[PDB]
Amino acid sequence: EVPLLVTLEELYLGKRKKIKVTREENIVEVEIKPGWKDGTKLTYSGEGDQESPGTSPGDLVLIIQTKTHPRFTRDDCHLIMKVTIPLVRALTGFTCPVTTLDRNLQIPIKEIVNPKTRKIVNEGMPIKNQPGQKGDLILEFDICFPKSLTPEQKKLIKEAL
Amino acid sequence: RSHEVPLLVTLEELYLGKRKKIKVTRKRFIEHKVRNEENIVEVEIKPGWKDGTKLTYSGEGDQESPGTSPGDLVLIIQTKTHPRFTRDDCHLIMKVTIPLVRALTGFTCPVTTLDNRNLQIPIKEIVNPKTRKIVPNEGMPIKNQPGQKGDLILEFDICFPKSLTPEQKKLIKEAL
């Protein structure tokens, strides 16, 4: 079998790639449907090796292989994004930047977020046979703590908390 | 012949060493039938021994045929889960649960050692979810060099407040 590396964006929207295969170097157009998961097998007849003149070329087997996305991790029909944010924003509030698979979607969080927080939002992957409907967007936070604080900051913190 | 049997010990026993009576069982032919015969043996647990340490008791194993000499019994040190510490090589790790205010402003951390000593450790620097505070010589004894010990490693489980009034947040903004 021959692996077919695709991206989450190509799996999100859809794409008709042009892969190169040698059996004699030819280019085969392979369509990608939204929602396809890893392991998906595709077979193209005639694109394989020919054993003899008196027989036609064999088939070509491809296996969907998703590449690592710099901003997302896939969990079935859900997407997960790690966002590094300063402790102060986690306690007081802030709007989170989200460059979806395609636009910019600003998500303002007001409530207190902690290391175990999982903000669940239709902003994940498209669900099979359900037009316009997508999975949930899970927001995970990487709260950055101050390296050090002055004696006065600590006093104010104790008074505040 | 020979077979292995777990010997369950506690971190307290591996820290202080312990001499005690252990009950073992093995196959023996009695009146033409195989029986599970219990016997009592003594074991001396040495400070610092690690999991996997094998103790071979010659002749305490299973008997294959009547009259023939019994094989050997092999005991393997296995450490029971401790409610306070996790052993890491020669170190001891302890997870301390604290409120966010203390993580940011300081506090004093109590620790009861395996030999029942009572420590009160000051935490002066800011601690965060990834902090690993190393406390010298408060780990396990090192089998190789006697008198020596590894370290105590303090990690923290910081509880964030569930809510904060608008006045409190404004104060936090000013502070941080």
> Resolution in angstroms, to 1 decimal, for this deposition?
1.9
- Give which of A151, A152, A141 is closest to A116, Cα–Cα: A141
Count of other CB atoms within 10 angstroms of residue A151: 7
CB nearest A112 (choices: B125, B129, B164)? B164
| Cα B50–chain centre separation | 10
Closest to B149 (Cα-Cα) out of B139, B161, B163, B159: B139
Query: Is A87 an interface residue toward B (CB < 8 Å)?
Result: yes
**Residue A151 three-state SS:** helix
Backbone angles phi, psi at B37, to 5 degrees: -90, 125
A157 touches chain B (CB under 8 A): yes
Identify the helix (H) or strand (E) that includes residue B158.
strand B152-159
Angstrom distance (rounded) from CA A123 to CA A132: 10
Torsion sign, CA atoms B13, B18, B23, B24: positive
* B160 vs A: CB within 8 A: yes
H or E, element range at A11? helix A8-12
Give kind and range of the element (H or E) at residue A155.
Answer: helix A151-160
Task: Give residue A144's Cα distance to chain centre.
Answer: 24
- Element housing A159 (H / E): helix A151-160
- HSE toward the beta carbon, residue B30, CA cutoff 13 A: 8
- Residues of chain A with C-beta less than 8 angstroms from the C-beta of B101: 157-158, 161
Q: Which residues in chain A have their CB less than 8 angstroms from residue B175's CB?
A: 153, 156-157, 160
Domains and their CATH numbers in chain B? 1-81 (2.60.260.20), 82-162 (2.60.260.20)
What is the full DSSP assignment across B75-109? EEEEEPP-SS-EEETTEEEEEEEEEHHHHHH-EEE
B157 interfaces chain A, CB cutoff of 8 Å: no
Sequence-separated contacts (24+) of A37-43 with Cβ below 8 Å: A37/A64, A37/A76, A38/A64, A38/A65, A38/A66, A39/A63, A39/A64, A40/A64, A41/A1, A42/A4
List the single residue in B with minimal CA-CA distance to A144.
B128
Name every chain A residue with its beta carbon within 8 A of the beta carbon of B169.
91-93
Residue type for position B46? K
Helical spans, DSSP H, in chain B: 11-16, 100-105, 166-175
Rounded alpha-carbon distances, angstroms, from residue B37 to B23, B29, B34: 10, 9, 9
Q: What is the DSSP letter of A126?
A: B
CB within 8 Å: A159 and B173? no
According to DSSP, residue A87 is labeled H
Residues of A in contact with B172 (CB under 8 A): 88, 91-92, 157, 160-161
For residues B100 and B168, the answer to whether their CB atoms sit within 8 Å is no
**Alpha helices of B1-145 — where are they, by DSSP H?**
11-16, 100-105
Residues A115, B163: C-beta atoms closer than 8 Å: no
Structure-determination approach: X-ray
List the single residue in A113, A115, A157 with the smallest CB-CB distance to B129.
Answer: A115
Q: How many CA atoms lie within 13 A of B147 on its CB side?
A: 0
Tokens 């964030």 belong to residue: B160
- Alpha-carbon span A156 to B175, nearest angstrom: 6
Chain A residues in contact with B171 (beta carbon < 8 A): 156, 159-160
The CA distance from B73 to B50, in Å, is 19
Nearest CA-CA partner of A132 in A140, A141, A123: A123
Q: Does B171 touch chain A (CB under 8 A)?
A: yes
At B24, list the tokens.
């073992």
